[PDB]
């Protein structure tokens, strides 16, 4: 099955093999397709095919009364009518079948994908919907004009929305673990808070299990355990800052005696519907305002060590042990001993 989209004039029609492009760090799925035009209608004109990318940065002041600044990260454009002789000479099986079926009315095109592009990730819409979304937009656009710099024609333009898709890796590493130690001037004895996960690689819909261990060598009594799952979503291009988006929280009231140990497995289940219509939440891209899941974690090569414009998604869980004795730092004061632990949540391809 392949996808098709026609112009309002009906003389231009673009056939693509698929809308979801699954890439990896090294291997990428290239963009291929054909464009059918009418040679007896588009006389003395030029038809071009481009793959474009854009970001629509949003601000709280801009949300009330502003125009969304659109910035193009990358833009590659090739000539499709008249055909360039320097283009790719062999055809793919898709392109071979489409050329054999349609004849000389259709012309093929291929595009490459650089490995330093952001995934198709958008932000949670507000209570009032502008009708224009916010996030990384990709499109394939074909157009016909006498002049390349004409940007006002609409009826001879065809645009299709595509999505950059990443798959969960099938080679998990060791179980992630973390430990923190807290000491105070008022109480020299250490408090050890350790937390570990059952797996490193998670699938969408899989709840998380954490083994929490507490070693209390002082006279303080543990009051509560707050386990918070957060999306550390960072955009390098907009600013040198990273948001700490709330995703899930679990407040357990299990107490621990002073100068004792404790070990307990907790289970957290990040329901999406709890985080409905919350600004700052990043989700996977979708077409025609359909339903979508949480944004998958972005895989980045360690060797490159380079920043990435757009939205970079990563998930970390923090275990805040809220402990208090009373009087040492204040009667109503408490110590929040917290440690973070990264995790990966993606969606499997097969």
């Amino acid at each position, epitope marked *: *099955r392949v996808f098709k989209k026609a112009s309002p004039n009906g003389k231009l029609t673009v056939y693509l093999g698929k809308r979801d492009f699954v890439d990896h760090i090294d291997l990428v799925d290239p963009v291929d397709g054909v464009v059918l035009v009418d040679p007896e209608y588009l006389k003395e004109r030029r038809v071009y095919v481009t793959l474009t990318c854009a970001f629509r940065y949003g601000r709280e002041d801009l949300d009330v009364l502003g125009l969304t600044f659109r910035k193009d990260l990358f833009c590659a454009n090739v000539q499709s009518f008249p055909p360039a002789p320097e283009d790719k000479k062999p055809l793919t099986r898709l392109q071979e079948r489409l050329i054999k079926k349609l004849g000389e009315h259709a012309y093929p095109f291929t595009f490459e994908i650089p490995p330093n592009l952001p995934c198709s990730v958008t932000l949670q819409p507000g209570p009032e919907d502008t009708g224009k979304a916010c996030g990384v937009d990709y499109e394939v656009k074909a157009f016909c004009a006498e002049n390349l710099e004409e940007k006002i024609h609409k009826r001879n333009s065809v645009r299709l929305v595509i999505r950059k898709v990443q798959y969960a890796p099938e080679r998990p590493g060791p179980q992630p673990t973390a430990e923190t130690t807290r000491q105070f001037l008022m109480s020299d004895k250490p408090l050890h808070l350790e937390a570990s996960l059952d797996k490193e690689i998670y699938y969408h*819909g899989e*709840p998380i299990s954490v083994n929490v261990h507490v070693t209390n060598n002082t006279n303080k009594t543990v009051k509560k355990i707050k386990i918070s799952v957060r999306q550390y979503a960072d955009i390098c291009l907009f600013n040198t800052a990273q948001y700490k988006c709330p995703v899930a929280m679990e407040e357990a009231d299990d107490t621990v005696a002073p100068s004792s140990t404790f070990c307990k497995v907790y289970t957290l*289940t990040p*329901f999406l519907c709890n985080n*409905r219509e919350k600004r700052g939440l990043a989700l996977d891209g979708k077409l025609k305002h359909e339903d979508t899941n949480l944004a998958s974690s972005t895989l980045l090569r360690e060797g490159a060590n380079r920043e990435i414009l757009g939205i970079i998604v990563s998930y970390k869980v923090k275990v805040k042990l809220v402990v208090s004795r009373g009087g040492l730092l204040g009667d109503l004061a408490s110590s929040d001993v917290a440690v973070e632990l990264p995790f990966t949540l993606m969606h499997p391809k097969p």
Partner: antibody, heavy 119, light 109 residues
Framework: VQLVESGGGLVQPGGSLRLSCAASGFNVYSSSIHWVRQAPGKGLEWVAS????????YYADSVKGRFTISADTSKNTAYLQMNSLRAEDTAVYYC?????????????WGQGTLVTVSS | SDIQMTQSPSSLSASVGDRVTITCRASQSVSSAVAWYQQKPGKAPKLLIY???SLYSGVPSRFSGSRSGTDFTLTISSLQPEDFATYYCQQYKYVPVTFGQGTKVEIKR
């Protein structure tokens, strides 16, 4: 993984009941829960669906206004409360589980329970 | 989006090893969301065919099929004695969810 329907049998029209669907070997956060019914002499038709991760509940047109459903995610147990019973509700009810991340269709099945609505 | 799915025939006679072709024609365009299930008498149904081309895991290779327009054909290259059950076609794309009529495979005598 097991799916066990419970709560069937002989009931009266105009009454009410609770049909449960116990589950083991999975979590409802990874799946969508569907209820279908087989009338005597007829095939399977959809009744209701719950999507736990999306938190979206859908109802057939024939059961809107009379039936309701919830689910216990800590026990993975579906709880369909039926009210305003009629004679055409006599059927074999199947509780089924589908994958949410990819719509593979019906995947996990129970054996279903027979409900007979007669005075 | 009520799609009328006409399954044909309602019953057919065949012998062991014959190629059985059962059609299911939708009233509206169903591009890929085609599934086929097999139900035994007194037993829960199982999933046989999914997305009109993919064979479900655990299903023997003798079950296949193809789509032309809105009409899907389920093909059994070698009919088995344990396959003498009821077959259902199903769509899973549009709301409400619709279903077939049921084809029972009988022994040709």
């Amino acid at each position: 993984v097991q799916l066990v329907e419970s709560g069937g049998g002989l009931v009266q029209p105009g009454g009410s009941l609770r049909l449960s669907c116990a589950a083991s070997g999975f979590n409802v956060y990874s799946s969508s829960i569907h209820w279908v019914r087989q009338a005597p002499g007829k095939g399977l038709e959809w009744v209701a669906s719950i999507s736990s991760y999306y938190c979206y509940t859908y109802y057939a047109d024939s059961v809107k206004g009379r039936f309701t459903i919830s689910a216990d995610t800590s026990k993975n147990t579906a709880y369909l409360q039926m009210n305003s019973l009629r004679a055409e509700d006599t059927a074999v009810y199947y509780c089924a589980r589908s994958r949410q991340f990819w719509y593979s269709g019906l995947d996990y099945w129970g054996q279903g329970t027979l409900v007979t609505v007669s005075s | 989006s009520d799609i009328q799915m006409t399954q044909s025939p309602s019953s057919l006679s065949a012998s062991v090893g014959d190629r059985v072709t059962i059609t299911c024609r939708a009233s509206q365009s169903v591009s890929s969301a085609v599934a086929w299930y097999q139900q035994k008498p007194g037993k829960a149904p199982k999933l046989l065919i999914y997305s009109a081309s993919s064979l479900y895991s655990g299903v023997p290779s003798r079950f296949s099929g193809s789509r032309s327009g809105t009409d899907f054909t389920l093909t059994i290259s070698s009919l088995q004695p344990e396959d003498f059950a009821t077959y259902y076609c199903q769509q899973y794309k549009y709301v409400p969810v619709t279903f077939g009529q049921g084809t029972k495979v009988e022994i040709k005598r």
